[PDB]
Structure 1
Amino acid sequence: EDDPNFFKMVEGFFDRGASIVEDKLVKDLRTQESEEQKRNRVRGILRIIKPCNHVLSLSFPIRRDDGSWEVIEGYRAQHSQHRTPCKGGIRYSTDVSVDEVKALASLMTYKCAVVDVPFGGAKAGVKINPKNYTENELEKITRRFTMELAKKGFIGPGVDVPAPDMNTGEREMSWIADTYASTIGHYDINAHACVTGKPISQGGIHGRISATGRGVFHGIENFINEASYMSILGMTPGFRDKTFVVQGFGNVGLHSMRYLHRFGAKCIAVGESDGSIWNPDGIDPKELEDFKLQHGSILGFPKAKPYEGSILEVDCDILIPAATEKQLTKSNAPRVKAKIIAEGANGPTTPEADKIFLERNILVIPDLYLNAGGVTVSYFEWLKNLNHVSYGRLTFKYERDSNYHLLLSVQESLERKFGKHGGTIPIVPTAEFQDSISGASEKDIVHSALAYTMERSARQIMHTAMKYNLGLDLRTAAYVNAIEKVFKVYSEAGVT
């Protein structure tokens, strides 16, 4: 039908943004040369950023539990190294391929540039199915995969920092960190910084589970509250009296629903590959999380009637795809009802569906910005391992005592002006402030920096969308910002 390969979509996105931003680069170039060599250098550097600089195809053996010997195919593509180390995920599926990991590594570069994360794009993948292997066989697969990557310069705290992905979690990252720290990187003081997404006992950061979901919430928060954009959608600014529908109740969809419902939004429908539930007056995220955790699925929810129609075509205000690639397609794009499509997954919309969404005045927040909350926090976890300290460990009580000193100072000052003859003017922190003071932890600092990143990056995409007047085409505006940033590091670094 419509669906292309994701490798074709990213190259098309780059070619679109490169042609628009080219004129800005040839003028901001302050090199001592004529304007033709300047445009040649701009077009020349763009020819370097697009292709993946390094791709590693691996074929390593393993001894299974039954005794037999198997050969495992693996891949690791490093898109660009303009900012070392590289960052990317490790996928465990039989659908992996060179064209697959090369595309998502290219997206990882521009996704990091959007959120100002100083990492290069990377992506890994091995041709196995984790259900076919046991826990012991998955460990020897993961540890041997780490050994081959270290010897070839595709993993390291200053070389390349892998991360969890499809069919991989903190369990695999713990094996990856322990393997590198015990062999190739034993003499490295930051050996545990070679991978992110680890458990807390292995060096992980707090707030990592809800990182991607909070990034989805903060991203649409900046645009649902911008009156200039919200007037075009035909809706009032704010989350109140707004209905959102989530596709895929995995990890992103769970926390996206949790954080939207907390701030006034109401969940109407939740669909997965198993089915689709619906309720026009709201679905509780906590009750749905416990039902999904108990029975392993969402079908049969007591406070939600089944929905046998399409989950993407449910009438609502916000639609959150959080599942597979290319869910919104040219054939189904003219049938959606939501005015805002919150891409909680990487590449869920075809470029032809983007064309229909643009001509229908449908705001689509692109994946390389909205699905970057976990990437941003992974940057903080990488910094945490380099600092060898938890955030706030040295300053929590120091800032707490100074905060109580400021309130006590106002109190004693107001008492000498208005309470000279008995009485007290108690200056106590608010109910919202005391919760932050009492339950102060690393999660509060991490999620605050995440919100600061999504806020600052939103103003960057808005400023570009209005400069080239792209309207609601924030995808092109995002790639323009990312291409300009990567070019800035190349152009000011010199030749070889």
Structure 2
Amino acid sequence: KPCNHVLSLSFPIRRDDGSWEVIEGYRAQHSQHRTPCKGGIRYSTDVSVDEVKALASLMTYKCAVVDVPFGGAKAGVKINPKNYTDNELEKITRRFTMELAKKGFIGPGVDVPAPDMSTGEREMSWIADTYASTIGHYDINAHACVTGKPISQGGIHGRISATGRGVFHGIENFDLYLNAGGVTVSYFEWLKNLNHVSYGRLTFKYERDSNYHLLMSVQESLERKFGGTIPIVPTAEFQDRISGASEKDIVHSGLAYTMERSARQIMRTAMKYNLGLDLRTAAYVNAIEKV
């Protein structure tokens, strides 16, 4: 129930105007029953310890709902990003990463941050660069320390539309459940960074050849029965699927599978505990009993 770790930070930054500023940030790690802990970073002037603790607990239960092996975490830096230049924001992000890494609050097997509405992929790129340069230099998984990265930096295809299509799939099956698509795709990005290869790179051509061979088998089997028949032509949509086979297809399929499994589990929990239309309680009971 309670957050087991909470770190309060105070670090100096050297402003462009020529003044020193003290920046205070927070990082709450809720549960270490599953490692690493997954969590976003919020660049807002209204952040507090209570908010990061609550969001870390929510993150833990959200990960438990969609069977993502992550603990809950939440960071927050008490700044207004619209009052700082890009250089100052880069300095703030890199020093925050340094302080978190020194205290064991960042790392591919410890604590993986993610972007937020106030942050973005540039901040994730800065975090990954800072970690790989200084602390995670001798780590082969150094770039798996953060998710939400750009494609050139190790990001995953299909991350921008992850939350919306997760919401769509959750609605189609029928907060803790509907808003979990981004968490699943961040888990997939973490896996892809650990794999050091994109999804389907070794599989696409092989599966294409196997499908064509199956269609040729149907061809020849129907030609043997009666003496012209062409059961080798794929449908139009199958042809676009074959031609445009990429990582986003695998990511979308994994997201849909995860959402379907979680919806079935929530339905079964709601039936077992004699709940009606109160799906929030069913999801929370499922997450609590999984943890």
Question: TM-score, normalising length from structure 2?
Answer: 0.98
Partners of 1:155 and 1:473 in 2: CA distance: 37
User: Does the 8 Å contact 1:93/1:127 carry over to 2?
Assistant: yes
Q: Deviations over 1:43-64 (max 9, x none)?
A: xxxxxxx000000010111001
1:187 is paired with a residue whose SS is coil
Partners of 1:447 and 1:426 in 2: CA distance: 29
Q: Tell me what 2:176 maps to.
A: 368
Considering only CA atoms, is the larger Rg found in Structure 1 or Structure 2? 1
1:61 is paired with a residue whose SS is strand
Give the drift of 1:424: 3.1
User: Does the 8 Å contact 2:39/2:114 carry over to 1?
Assistant: yes
Tell me which of 4, 8, 11 is aligned to 1:60.
11
Q: Deviations over 1:29-80 (max 9, x none)?
A: xxxxxxxxxxxxxxxxxxxxx0000000101110011121101110000000
Tell me which of 219, 223, 231 is aligned to 1:426.
231
Give the drift of 1:430: 1.4
Give the drift of 1:468: 1.0
* More divergent stretch after superposition (409-418 vs 189-198): 409-418
2:22 is paired with a residue whose SS is strand
Q: Tell me what 1:397 maps to.
A: 205
2:21 is paired with a residue whose SS is strand
Give the drift of 1:166: 2.5
1:62 is paired with a residue whose SS is strand
Partners of 1:407 and 1:431 in 2: CA distance: 15
Q: Deviations over 1:274-302 (max 9, x none)?
A: xxxxxxxxxxxxxxxxxxxxxxxxxxxxx
Q: Deviations over 1:75-105 (max 9, x none)?
A: 0000001000000000000110000000000
Give the drift of 1:425: 2.4
Partners of 1:477 and 1:463 in 2: CA distance: 9
User: Does the 8 Å contact 2:222/2:229 carry over to 1?
Assistant: no
User: Does the 8 Å contact 1:77/1:122 carry over to 2?
Assistant: yes
User: Does the 8 Å contact 2:212/2:232 carry over to 1?
Assistant: no
Give the drift of 1:175: 0.3
Aligned residue runs from structure 1 range 264-303, under 5 A: none
1:370 is paired with a residue whose SS is coil
Partners of 1:114 and 1:424 in 2: CA distance: 50
Give the drift of 1:201: 0.4
Q: Tell me what 2:240 maps to.
A: 435
User: Does the 8 Å contact 2:28/2:56 carry over to 1?
Assistant: yes
Q: Deviations over 1:446-492 (max 9, x none)?
A: 01000000000000000011111110111110010111xxxxxxxxx
2:27 is paired with a residue whose SS is strand
1:91 is paired with a residue whose SS is strand
Within the alignment, does 1:113 sit opposite 2:64 as a pair?
yes
Give the drift of 1:428: 1.2
Partners of 1:189 and 1:175 in 2: CA distance: 18
Give the drift of 1:434: 1.3
- Gapped runs of 5+ residues in structure 2? none
Matched residues, percent identical?
Answer: 98
Give the drift of 1:196: 0.3
Tell me which of 47, 67, 70 is aligned to 1:96.
47
Q: Deviations over 1:123-179 (max 9, x none)?
A: 000100110001111000000000000000100000000000131011100000000
User: Does the 8 Å contact 2:94/2:130 carry over to 1?
Assistant: yes
Give the drift of 1:427: 2.4
User: Does the 8 Å contact 2:218/2:231 carry over to 1?
Assistant: no
2:231 is paired with a residue whose SS is coil
Partners of 1:105 and 1:426 in 2: CA distance: 54
Give the drift of 1:423: 2.2
User: Does the 8 Å contact 1:60/1:71 carry over to 2?
Assistant: yes
Within the alignment, does 1:166 sit opposite 2:117 as a pair?
yes
1:162 is paired with a residue whose SS is strand
Partners of 1:426 and 1:371 in 2: CA distance: 43
Give the drift of 1:413: 1.1
Give the drift of 1:426: 3.7
Partners of 1:380 and 1:214 in 2: CA distance: 15
Partners of 2:25 and 2:92 in 1: CA distance: 10
User: Does the 8 Å contact 2:39/2:59 carry over to 1?
Assistant: yes
User: Does the 8 Å contact 1:90/1:166 carry over to 2?
Assistant: no
Partners of 2:46 and 2:212 in 1: CA distance: 56
Q: Deviations over 1:356-415 (max 9, x none)?
A: xxxxxxxxxxx1110000000100000000000000011110111111111111011111
Partners of 2:257 and 2:236 in 1: CA distance: 23
Give the drift of 1:431: 1.6
Once superposed, what is the RMSD of the aligned Cα atoms?
Answer: 1.3
User: Does the 8 Å contact 1:154/1:160 carry over to 2?
Assistant: yes
2:26 is paired with a residue whose SS is strand
Q: Deviations over 1:180-207 (max 9, x none)?
A: 0000110000000000000000000110
User: Does the 8 Å contact 1:93/1:166 carry over to 2?
Assistant: no
Partners of 1:87 and 1:143 in 2: CA distance: 19
Partners of 2:235 and 2:46 in 1: CA distance: 52
Partners of 2:122 and 2:228 in 1: CA distance: 59
Tell me which of 260, 277, 287 is aligned to 1:482.
287
- Gapped runs of 5+ residues in structure 1? 1-49, 224-366, 484-495
